[model samples]
Target chain A: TNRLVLSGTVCRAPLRKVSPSGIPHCQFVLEHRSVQEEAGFHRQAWCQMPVIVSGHENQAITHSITVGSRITVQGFISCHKAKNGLSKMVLHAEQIELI
Target chain B: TNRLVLSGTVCRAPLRKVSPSGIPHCQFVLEHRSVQEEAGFHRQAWCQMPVIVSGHENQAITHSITVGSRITVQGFISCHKAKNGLSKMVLHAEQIELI
Candidate 1:
């Protein structure tokens, strides 16, 4: 069970790139703000989650993704190697719905 | 929208503490490994997600948490300031199930 759904505004400009194998890719930072319940307490939840849309199939819907666009993304989370030997978590979206 | 469910093994030891207001807290890192589909391709997914369980109500189920424990955590995700001025994403667990 690795399913994750997040609704947020695009906080950074989308960056389009091509993988080493020429797969189309687009990624950006999403700013999520919500009030969630935890242990009987209402806690404010927020995050700047990095979103990735890879391959031709995932590129079509991301064309309209821009800064300040509020959208919902359904996907799974994965961590990849980053600079300084650190691993960063990112969301790989299978679906995106604009609000 | 900030619903997230993750199944993983505890890769880090659980640390228990109390907040400034005396709220009980426990947090650890989870290692998840799975096969997921991405853009019509099968990809191996892995991540070491930081998980936090706050308040006394949330601490009960987490009592058995230890390194190598396999469990499923249902929660919302949040990012908070960490060392080096970088923010780290963390899962705020509302429920924990042993597996």
Candidate 2:
């Protein structure tokens, strides 16, 4: 399958929250910048793909994550609506292993 | 960055090999079944993305991976040339945590 890849640094503190069942969910933002291509050539946009990590999904890093950590993530582009009424699109991960 | 997602059954046996450095690498082939659309509906082709894992990349599952395991992987579509002269584009995962 055709997929986009990311190898970059974590720019923000991981947003950690817990579920009613007591499982913790961590949301992280990753900043990835592509190397400068030939000048004048258009490039894809850099983004902070929101990563959803659940304590139940894996045990390590379930409680905490830090900033400036190098990470690589992959998923598909999808838009989901939140209760706040705004739609957000991100690289929705189905499977992700920390590198 | 934008990436692709995969959730499917592992179809082939996990290819486990050890590197000269004593690190282990695991290769698995996954078959994902997505519902086909109607006569007038369009759908994308399903594919088996090659995943690369090293023992140092993670601590768990470094020694083995079993078939029939459900997994999700995300990465970029890339073409790499091997010494044997064959080229392949896979969803080269940067992050893939087992579900």
Candidate 3:
């Protein structure tokens, strides 16, 4: 178990999907910025954090979470099987508050 | 083009590591809890979420982020190459605050 503090910008609009059991899922890209150093110069490096939005409220947050809107998400990590039968990691949020 | 919202509890301590470029990397286990259904009862399912903590303050958030401590973090998504020649995704936090 781990508690992660995430800060970054919204990279894209969430993609809505559903499970075989009719469970709703939303996948989105989270862009995180880091400092990069090269040739005696410093730059910024961006990382892609894949996220899945579940639950009924997730849809509301997914739509409300527009691109370029700054936000903070704190949650535990999880892995799930996609409809495609691929295994992926995701954060299951229990407490979400807009920052 | 996408925005993600997250919430949950801290699972374990953030493990401290380093990048090939001498960048400090902290890896930790994040457990996400989900509601489950069985027969006629609804249970909770916990999923494993992997997190890599970088930067100096991440260490602070690591130790300070005790298990069960509620938090909120917001940022973008990113992917990076692992030392093992694998590509993994992570969230690049730019804004973080305790809930």
Q: Give TM-scores of chain A for all candidates.
A: 0.92, 0.65, 0.63
Across A25-57, the per-residue lDDT of candidate 1 in tens digits comes to 999999999998865678888998899988887
Over the full model, what C-alpha lDDT does candidate 2 score relative to the true structure? 0.53
Tens digit of lDDT per residue, candidate 2, span B1-99? 445556666777877777786766676766664543212224343545456554555536524456777777654433345344334334444456565
- State the lDDT of candidate 1 residue by residue for B6-79, as single tens digits: 99999999999998888888989989999999977888999999999988776887888899999999989998
Top candidate when judged by lDDT against the true structure: 1
Model 2 DockQ class: incorrect
Residue pairs with colliding backbones in model 1 are none
Candidate 2's TM-score: 0.42
lDDT of 2 at A57: 51
Give one digit per residue, the lDDT tens place, for model 3 in A4-95. Answer: 44566778777788778766777666666766432233545565556665666445666677677676666555556745443565654444
Which prediction has the highest TM-score against the true structure?
1
**Candidate 3 C-alpha lDDT tens digits along B1-99:** 223234456577666777677766565544446564322345455554455556664556556666675554443445667686665655444334454
Off by over 4 Å in 2: A1-99, B36-40, B62-64, B82-86
lDDT for A77 in candidate 2 is: 39
Model 3, position B14: C-alpha lDDT score: 64
**Native contacts retained, all candidates in order:** 0.91, 0.16, 0.18
| Clashing pairs in model 2, backbone N/Cα/C closer than 3 A | A3-B76, A4-B75, A4-B76, A5-B76, A75-B3, A96-B96, A96-B97, A97-B96, A97-B97
**Complex DockQ per candidate:** 0.77, 0.08, 0.15
Ranking by lDDT: 1, 3, 2
